[PDB]
Amino acid sequence: RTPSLPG
Amino acid sequence: GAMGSMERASLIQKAKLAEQAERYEDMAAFMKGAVEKGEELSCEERNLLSVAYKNVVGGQRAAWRVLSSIEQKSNGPEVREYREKVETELQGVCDTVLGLLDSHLIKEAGDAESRVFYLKMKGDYYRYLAEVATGDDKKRIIDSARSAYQEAMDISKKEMPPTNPIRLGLALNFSVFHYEIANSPEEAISLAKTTFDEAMADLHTLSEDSYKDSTLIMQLLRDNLTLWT
Amino acid sequence: GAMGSMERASLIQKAKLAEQAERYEDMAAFMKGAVEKGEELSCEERNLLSVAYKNVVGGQRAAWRVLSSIEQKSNGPEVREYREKVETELQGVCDTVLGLLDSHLIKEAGDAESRVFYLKMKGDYYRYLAEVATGDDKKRIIDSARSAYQEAMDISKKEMPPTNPIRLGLALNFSVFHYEIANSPEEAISLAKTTFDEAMADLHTLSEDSYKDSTLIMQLLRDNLTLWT
Amino acid sequence: TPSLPG
Numbered sequence A: 001r002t003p004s005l006p007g
Numbered sequence B, C: 001g002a003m004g005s006m007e008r009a010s011l012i013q014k015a016k017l018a019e020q021a022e023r024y025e026d027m028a029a030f031m032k033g034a035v036e037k038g039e040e041l042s043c044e045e046r047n048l049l050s051v052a053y054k055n056v057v058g059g060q061r062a063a064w065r066v067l068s069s070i071e072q073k074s075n076g077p078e079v080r081e082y083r084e085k086v087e088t089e090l091q092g093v094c095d096t097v098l099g100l101l102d103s104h105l106i107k108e109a110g111d112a113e114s115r116v117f118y119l120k121m122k123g124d125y126y127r128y129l130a131e132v133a134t135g136d137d138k139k140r141i142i143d144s145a146r147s148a149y150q151e152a153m154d155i156s157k158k159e160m161p162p163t164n165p166i167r168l169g170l171a172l173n174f175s176v177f178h179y180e181i182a183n184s185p186e187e188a189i190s191l192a193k194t195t196f197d198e199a200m201a202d203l204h205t206l207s208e209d210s211y212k213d214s215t216l217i218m219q220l221l222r223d224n225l226t227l228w229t
Numbered sequence D: 001t002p003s004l005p006g
């Protein structure tokens, strides 16, 4: 999937 | 509960130790206990809560995707059973987080920074539930995620500058929601582009350190835009 | 236990799925359930058992060491308390593994290789307990580890060639026990040296792949000898 | 000192 906020 | 007899400050301290030891389940349990003391979380404490549960649910989501892929390619009961076991545990963690948000953390009163942070989080955890849902149940979960993100968006546009990192991260995740969950790639692309452009125009107002904080998230928006277009 | 109602073959299948999903606690629980069916394990199955629990206990050992280091540097009660929590969890996992070995993997092992494998494992898990034990309990644990390792040594010297990788790995771990746990550097060096020389004598008889396997573990013995001498 | 890595 598309990456979301990593934090 | 098992944290009820522990001091709030000790729970926070142990959450930080658990993070250093990469014991994210423990970290989350300590932060849950701290929330249950009934005092509002500071900015640092909100971050600790979020990091803890992100890592817990992140491991579960990764495992679920592995098992779901094995299951789809197989299509005895064992793969389905084990995928269902992981799915149920994932849903339980999401329900725990959503319960903390609704019972303790989301308030009508509150500063914009906390209200947006928690509504974004609510959107995220409904989104994680949507990833594993099907049919009409999926529809209702999708609408719950959308509603939480939309309220966070409305507050963030009224009460925060367009470079605010929390606002930017909300827009990043809401655009991911549009693209990956809601079957709305055009809306995802439009939101990422306008968010990026409106932040870029205001970077000139920021200190060196704030510029780095904002541009790091803008760079993520750009990465998704360039992936999608 | 909780796995008592699941077929042995289903437990093995799910242990392999858990490994693919990097769900090592699940993997260990499935393998515990398989052991508790009371049938011997194949070589593949005893490797699954060992991998699962090594991953679980390895994560606990790493966390314990992080917390112990913070505790040592600090010299409130919170660091000690959390270190003790992790320690108790680690002790529980080691007790679980030792219980499987004593009831009844060791006594039911049908060949020398598997009996050595399990007795070595018994020494290893007592050694992990010894790393965190104190006082009289530590002394008892140290004697238990030594006794298990020594029985494995006796069998391996009678039944397996000196280049056999399981024999070499036993000697490696027993020598580590001598040096790191039992404060017996002379015994550690003597064991590692004798093992190294007796394996070298037979290297010329081995296939390419066996030569590689044996020299790899010989090099681990060498690394420790260099640190120790 | 390191033990067997598996």
Ligand SMILES: *N1CCC[C@@H]1[C@H](c1ccccc1)c1ccccc1OC
Pocket: A005, A006, A007, B046, B047, B048, B050, B051, B169
């Ligand atoms: N993500 C959301 C809240 C916790 C985490 C956040 C973050 C955001 C973007 C990139 C990396 C990390 C976080 C985590 C820990 C401390 C601070 C922090 O953001 C302020």
Ligand SMILES: *N1CCC[C@@H]1[C@H](c1ccccc1)c1ccccc1OC
Pocket: C047, C050, C051, D004, D005, D006
């Ligand atoms: N360590 C002992 C039992 C499992 C693991 C072993 C191993 C030993 C040394 C280096 C790497 C791996 C292992 C693990 C997985 C498959 C086979 C295997 O050895 C037979």
Ligand SMILES: [Cl-]
Pocket: B081, B082, B085, C014
């Ligand atoms: Cl299952």
Ligand SMILES: [Cl-]
Pocket: B014, C081, C082, C085
């Ligand atoms: Cl604790």
Ligand code: NA
Pocket: B003, B004, B005, B036, B037
């Ligand atoms: Na309380």
Ligand code: NA
Pocket: B112, B159, B160, B161
């Ligand atoms: Na403001």
Ligand code: NA
Pocket: B186, B189, B190, B193
């Ligand atoms: Na567009």
Ligand code: NA
Pocket: B222, B223, B224, B225, B226, B227
């Ligand atoms: Na890209």
Ligand code: NA
Pocket: B225, B226, B227, B228, B229
């Ligand atoms: Na592109």
Ligand code: NA
Pocket: C161, C162, C202
């Ligand atoms: Na020989």
Ligand code: NA
Pocket: C197, C198, C199, C201
């Ligand atoms: Na020799």
